[model samples]
Target: SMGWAAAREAAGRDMLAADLRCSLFASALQSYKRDSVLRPFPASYARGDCKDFEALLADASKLPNLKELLQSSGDNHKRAWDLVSWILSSKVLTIHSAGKAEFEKIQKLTGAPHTPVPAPDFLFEIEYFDPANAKFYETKGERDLIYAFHGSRLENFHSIIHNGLHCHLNKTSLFGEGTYLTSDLSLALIYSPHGHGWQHSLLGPILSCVAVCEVIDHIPPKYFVVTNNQLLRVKYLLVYSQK
Candidate 1:
């Protein structure tokens, strides 16, 4: 049977992988420039907003040696963040994010649930600027260049917050039970230019990948310890990974 230290290392690796995937997912969404706003989906299985999609991608199953890592990260917070950084550096996670097939393979391997988010239902508002009114410019140049840059900052920020926190693993009170411990890895870098709305304004989603690894590491083998912490009813059951 693997000892606690070995198990923790395995979990840390998994957490690192998951974080990298999450960043790649965010980058992909940004690439489309699809309003950078959160949209809703009609399907019931689609539990996330735009942000939730990001959160789901950040799930712990994407990591290496997930079970062992989960337990380790759960034991300490600093170690958790360190693991998150590792995930950001992983090539496996990067390839998956950049390659469609790779991403699908990850989901398949993990057997994690997939749900599609829907588009937003209504429109909000925006503010327009007039350069023509300014005396600094000598000429107006091309009329096309002035194509009114406008959109609702309120709604846009709302979307960011919506996606930023929607699937947040830490917000357990809002999500309720059935919510697993694996969520410690999920959060937004809330202090980025993107994190303008939150209270602390600190970098969120910060290296949570490491935290994930620790959690997986600590996972108890099936019946290793009974649900009630009682003695094993029979012989000690040992589990092993393909080290």
Candidate 2:
């Protein structure tokens, strides 16, 4: 058929089109979430609808994986590809039911109560993409200024008693219910009617998976010089790394 140059041009078009399609679906889901939440009916039902759509898109976009999709292309497409990958691989994704089940499983494995009004001291890492290069690794510690809220001393925003509870709930399907349980039971009354400071047995695994996927999405696409002396892009850096 056509030469390498022509093939590359066609591939670029395809990548752009795929990205646009994904964006549209994401936008539509966000709109649904906003509309449903504002509705008079139960907020949980509305949120469930939102979660269902999100999970569907997340699973769909996950097929090719971000690393492979970007690695297959050149530097020109790396930014869009990496970002798309990150969104798809994020822990916040998955169908509402799946996500809820995950949270429930976490609670069960940890021996935590059904609803803790407030959660205990907790920590989580969020992936921050580099602007200069689509794929770069930089921990939060490396940053000069890590958001004001991280350093806030005020109880309303920084107190583990209040904010920590909200933080844990925000990340799970329980949302408000989780916060209420943690607050009312005091973490002690709920678990064993005495044990305080809930410790999770399985939280680390879930968090670890999220972190690993985020890292994978941030890796630069593999670049190579083909036998024909042409620059070729790999479809996945991790896969290439193994070889």
Candidate 3:
């Protein structure tokens, strides 16, 4: 027989795995609804008999872990519920804002869901001017240039610009950034950009790549250059080469 502690740990692992599977299933269902052509049917499933697929989904939803995930009040859980509800009821889920003015104020302070805050005001300011050529230059005018900081890092004046960017871009909620505490008790950044509007969804990610590369260029070779380079490659794939 497994030791009690070991058994508990195993149970926890199983629950976590189940939660992940449900989350993936929810995503797949959304994709299937949005673009069934792109999401081909599984070998065992037939496109004609969607009833069978629905049945399979029904079975999956019955899992206790999935139930807990959907019932939970967290953003991830709510999103999972939204996706799952769409699959089950064929109705799109909506997030209702209670107070219009309050919500707008919140929206201004923090950006729309999954969107990064806008770059700071100074970043948009013209850095230099040439009277002879009548030329103007900006410090960092990229619309996609967002900043993220962990917790009270936003409270400090030194990193205020960075904090402002995060505040402006991130969703208007405490858990908007999808941050989690690290082993050292620091909040880990979850640099997610918005997916709602065309400007934010498509252009945001592209411009963000440029902004990151710009920041990386200013870093000392011996400092965070390697780490930042690795991050850039992993996250943005260095989509377009910097000048």
Candidate 4:
């Protein structure tokens, strides 16, 4: 077996191979709300195949949750992975300090004036990879950027990352017809389990995923719903694992 270096090299390869980028979805979103009338999922909008939801998502459900994600096909693969690698290699790694520093940062960003979280073990402080994420922060004015965690079963990462968190794809909406998110870390953790992922047997069993999003401040302190994708931006992904 190998050490952390092996994991990094393989993980980088895996990240590239997986080909999870928000390029098409995020870009198309511009034209979606262009006139300010938020089109419902059944109506024409970004990723028009929302009706074929299961069919399209049937493809993403084929990818795994772990890294070592840097090898797959060609053409669009290069363009997408360049962005993925640039984002992953931007600062050089998942910093070793899964420290409490970020817990307070979360509470501060999602400020309800609540006390900071204590943080958990196996937590890897990952670099925030969104370029436009800061623009939202600057754009939020004095309203302050509030955050919520969007969690999914492992195989669903590809769809969520590439297509944006959509309500149509949700199998069941516990809260209503809208997308569900929670400010509670434990609740997020429960939803993000590794269910039926095509995990690499050669690699070690570690590294899970959950999205930490900057959401519009229209909900409550616990679990909440974002009425539309226009009101949200996936800022950081909380990547962690258990042995």
Evaluated against the true structure, the overall lDDT of model 3 is 0.26
Assess every candidate by TM-score.
0.17, 0.20, 0.22, 0.47
lDDT of 4 by residue, 1-243 (tens): 223344336455444222222211222222233232112222212355434344323332343333323333333343333333332332212322344577568656655444343244323333334454455555566775577887765445544544457765454755556778887766676777643223332212333567778776642347877767756766565655445
Record all residue pairs in model 3 with backbone atoms less than 3 Å apart, i.e. clashing. 114-193, 114-194, 115-194, 116-169, 117-168, 117-169
Query: Per-residue lDDT for 69 in model 1?
Result: 39
Please report, in order, the local distance difference test score of every candidate based on alpha carbons. Answer: 0.25, 0.26, 0.26, 0.46
- The order of the candidates by TM-score, greatest first, is 4, 3, 2, 1
Per-residue lDDT of 1-243 in model 1, one digit per residue for the tens?
233455345435444323333332333333333234433211221444434444333432233333333554554544333433433332111211123443333234323433331111111111112431131122322321111011122223323212221222343466442212221111211111221221111112211111101011112211111121111011100111111
- Per-candidate RMSD vs. true structure? 25.8, 20.2, 20.7, 10.9
lDDT of 2 by residue, 44-108 (tens): 22365454444443443443432344456545553344434433232211211123344333344
Give the local distance difference test score of model 1: 0.25
lDDT of 3 by residue, 113-176 (tens): 2433332111111011243112111332342332222222111211211111122324675555
Q: Return the TM-score for candidate 2, rounded to 2 decimals.
A: 0.20
| Collision count for each candidate, in order | 38, 15, 6, 15
Q: After superposition, how far is residue 117 of candidate 1 from its true place, in Å?
A: 39
